[PDB]
Amino acid sequence: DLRLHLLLNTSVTCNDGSPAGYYLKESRGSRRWLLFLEGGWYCFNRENCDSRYDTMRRLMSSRDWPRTRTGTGILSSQPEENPYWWNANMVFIPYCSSDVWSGASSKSEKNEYAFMGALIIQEVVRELLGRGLSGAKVLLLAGSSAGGTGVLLNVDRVAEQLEKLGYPAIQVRGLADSGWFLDNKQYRPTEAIRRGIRYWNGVVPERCRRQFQEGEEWNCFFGYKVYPTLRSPVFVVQWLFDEAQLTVDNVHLPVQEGLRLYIQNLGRELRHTLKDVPASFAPACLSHEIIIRSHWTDVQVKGTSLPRALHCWDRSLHPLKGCPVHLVDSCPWPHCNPSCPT
Numbered sequence: 001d002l003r004l005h006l007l008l009n010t011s012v013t014c015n016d017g018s019p020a021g022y023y024l025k026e027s028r029g030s031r032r033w034l035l036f037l038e039g040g041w042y043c044f045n046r047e048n049c050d051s052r053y054d055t056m057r058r059l060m061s062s063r064d065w066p067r068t069r070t071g072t073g074i075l076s077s078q079p080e081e082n083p084y085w086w087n088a089n090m091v092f093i094p095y096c097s098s099d100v101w102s103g104a105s106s107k108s109e110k111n112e113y114a115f116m117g118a119l120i121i122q123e124v125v126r127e128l129l130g131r132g133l134s135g136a137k138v139l140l141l142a143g144s145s146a147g148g149t150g151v152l153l154n155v156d157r158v159a160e161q162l163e164k165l166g167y168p169a170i171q172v173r174g175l176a177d178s179g180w181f182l183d184n185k186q187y188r189p190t191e192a193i194r195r196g197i198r199y200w201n202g203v204v205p206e207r208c209r210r211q212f213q214e215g216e217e218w219n220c221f222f223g224y225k226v227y228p229t230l231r232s233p234v235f236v237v238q239w240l241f242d243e244a245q246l247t248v249d250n251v252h253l254p255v256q257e258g259l260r261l262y263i264q265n266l267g268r269e270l271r272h273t274l275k276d277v278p279a280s281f282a283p284a285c286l287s288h289e290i291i292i293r294s295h296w297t298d299v300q301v302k303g304t305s306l307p308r309a310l311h312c313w314d315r316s317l318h319p320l321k322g323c324p325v326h327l328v329d330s331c332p333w334p335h336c337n338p339s340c341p342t
């Protein structure tokens with residue numbers, strides 16, 4: 001079980017001003033630290049955020065959080081469930097800022113809500129240094145869905161933070177699960193993120209911001225545009241036919257010719273964006289399943305599971321015979337890979 005700690009700096013807050021926090025399970029025989037960002041969409045104006053506060057309040061407030069949580073998938077401490085990193089120090093950071101982990105704005109006389117996701121990550125890191133992270137060899141910042149996009153937006157800032165605080169030996173790496181999206185044509189989002197950024201005082205990686213410049217920061221929320229600007233090593237996990245991508249594309253699965261062509265073109269475009277991503281795992285599945293599910297071990301690409309691919313990635317950061325790290329399906333239709341989640 002992971003144990004809740006509310007941030008000691010209580011001015012770093014969830015949307016409603018309650019303190020943010022993290023769940024921690026220490027493994028004192030390990031110098032590996034896994035910090036996982038929860039997902040859960042976002043909100044981008046007063047009326048939309050008010051609705052979320054009524055029926056998704058745990059994603060906006062710590063007032064009702066439980067004292068403990070169970071680690072599952074890559075956050076499990078059991079070797080059978082987590083062949084990759086079962087002995088690591090485990091951290092789960094709840095998503096309570098509704099800003100895709102980009103915000104740096106407090107409540108005030110003019111702001112009904114606080115959007116502090118980027119500051120929440122930095123404060124968790126800072127408070128963990130006094131609890132053993134100062135002795136780490138590797139800090140893996142991971143996340144799923146909006147948390148996977150959050151990894152892409154924040155991994156280099158964590159690296160910079162540790163360097164400036166005097167910890168140059170900790171190697172910061174990223175694992176982005178189901179956060180790699182395309183700004184493609186719909187079958188029947190960039191506007192909502194554009195408004196969200198202004199509402200949140202959202203911040204993006206500086207090298208990406210310098211490319212796209214003022215007012216165009218929304219580009220940096222798209223993996224294929226922000227990834228080439230990052231310096232930390234980042235492993236990308238993305239279904240070729242991700243259900244959230246298809247939802248924003250207004251696709252809801254007898255498929256006729258126009259829809260068949262649309263779905264096949266989407267898979268090919270996703271494949272193309274991963275061609276120059278050397279550490280990646282992209283199965284040809286229609287899914288919303290994420291890496292904290294207990295059966296995450298079951299899916300294979302070309303005969304290699306994701307826990308194995310991640311272990312090969314570890315070895316590469318010390319090509320390897322029998323230990324691949326670039327695993328992208330080439331078949332063109334959902335479930336043409338037999339190991340897809342049922």
Ligand SMILES: Cn1ncc(Cl)c1C(=O)N1CCCCC1
Nearest residue numbers: 041145146181189193221244245
């Ligand atoms: C937050 N999120 N989770 C799943 C999906 Cl899809 C989204 C999403 O729509 N966006 C806007 C465009 C790209 C990045 C964030």
Ligand SMILES: *[C@@H]1O[C@H](CO)[C@@H](O)[C@H](O)[C@H]1NC(C)=O
Nearest residue numbers: 009010011012106119120123
């Ligand atoms: C608490 O966090 C806020 C926001 O990041 C910061 O302005 C303030 O200096 C912090 N306080 C302390 C004591 O570190």
